[PDB]
């Protein structure tokens, strides 16, 4: 049923302070390996 009268963006009422960081932690398993610059730090 098509409905143009309600607001469907209601999930942000239930977001906590750590929602972004837990989402990033869950996303960390899907990521590709990062490239390396060949050194630990520019001060190394």
């Amino acid at each position: 049923p098509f409905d143009n009268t309600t607001y469907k963006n209601l999930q942000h009422h239930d977001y906590s302070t750590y929602t972004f960081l837990d989402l990033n932690l869950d996303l960390s398993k899907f990521r590709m390996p990062q490239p390396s610059s060949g050194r630990e730090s520019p001060r190394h």
Binding site: S37, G38, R39, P42, R43, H44
Partner: protein, 63 residues
């Protein structure tokens, strides 16, 4: 307590365009002289992008 002196040539400073004019003036007046060569700065290599290198140690920690 003032600064007294007995040297008349203390405030003598002479200006010459080149080294050879100064050498000729010193030899003409009979003054024993020493001469030191001119020190110019060596040309450096400056690059603004080197502050944001990818793998070199020349990255700046802050800007």
């Amino acid at each position: 307590g003032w600064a007294s002196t007995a040297d008349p040539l203390s405030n003598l400073v002479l200006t010459f365009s080149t080294k050879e004019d100064a050498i000729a003036f010193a030899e003409k007046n009979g003054w024993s002289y020493d001469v030191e060569e001119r020190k110019v700065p060596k040309p450096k290599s400056k690059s603004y992008g080197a502050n944001f290198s990818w793998n070199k140690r020349t990255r700046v920690s802050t800007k």
